[PDB]
Design a protein around this ligand. Structure first.
Ligand SMILES: [Zn+2]
Ligand SMILES: [Zn+2]
Ligand SMILES: [Zn+2]
Ligand SMILES: [Zn+2]
Ligand SMILES: [Zn+2]
Ligand SMILES: [Zn+2]
Ligand SMILES: [Zn+2]
Lengths: 124, 124
């Protein structure tokens, strides 16, 4: 009976809030014309005290690296590119990031992009 | 009965020689620390008048783009990084390239790296 890791990688508190962070190694991610492969991060609405996070990336990200994505997002507070809304805990919100997670190419909410909810649902 | 494209994408003559170029869209390729995803190109030995080429890349490359890889290789004549040998038509030879195929990170021959022959054999 060989074990298998399942569910969230790490659970963290930050800014008085609790984040359950899932991740998947996938290359089904956006890329620049130049050839830099991006990552998706999707933030879910707070449900039962906890905000679900899903990081889809082409590389294996350790727990420190995963925790830093939440921090960078919380401290950047990026706005939806289509409507200007920030993640408020009631919506889903997706960023596309390159440069080892530090540079956002895109940010969008699920009222402007409903499909982002199916993205994280597949992992969650 | 739905058709399916098979075998080589393009066959080209250059420098008095004939190249049969295969390709595969794959993300099982090398990458830089920064996040630039590379491509493999493997040159086979001339057998029955023809040199087999196999381009493994994370993007869909049209026939012009595939033909340019052969040209850039023929005109660069890069040397094996481990022994200094050039592709001579008798050996297999692999380059790793980024920057839309123009910049070689690595070049190696199959006496120094025997596994490169299994790389192209899977596609061929
Ligand atoms: Zn803080
Ligand atoms: Zn990839
Ligand atoms: Zn929006
Ligand atoms: Zn939602
Ligand atoms: Zn020429
Ligand atoms: Zn060599
Ligand atoms: Zn060989």
């Amino acid at each position: 009976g060989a074990m298998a890791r399942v569910g969230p990688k790490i659970e963290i508190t930050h800014g008085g809030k609790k984040y359950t962070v899932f991740s998947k190694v996938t290359h089904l991610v956006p890329r620049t014309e130049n050839g830099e492969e991006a990552e998706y991060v999707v933030f879910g609405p707070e449900k039962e005290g906890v905000i679900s996070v899903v990081v889809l990336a082409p590389k294996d990200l350790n727990e420190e690296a995963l925790a830093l994505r939440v921090k960078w997002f919380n401290d950047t507070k990026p706005r939806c590119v289509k409507c200007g809304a920030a993640y408020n805990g009631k919506n889903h919100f997706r960023v596309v990031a390159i440069r080892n997670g530090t540079y956002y190419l895109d940010a969008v909410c699920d009222k402007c992009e409903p499909r982002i909810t199916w993205l994280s649902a597949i992992v969650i």
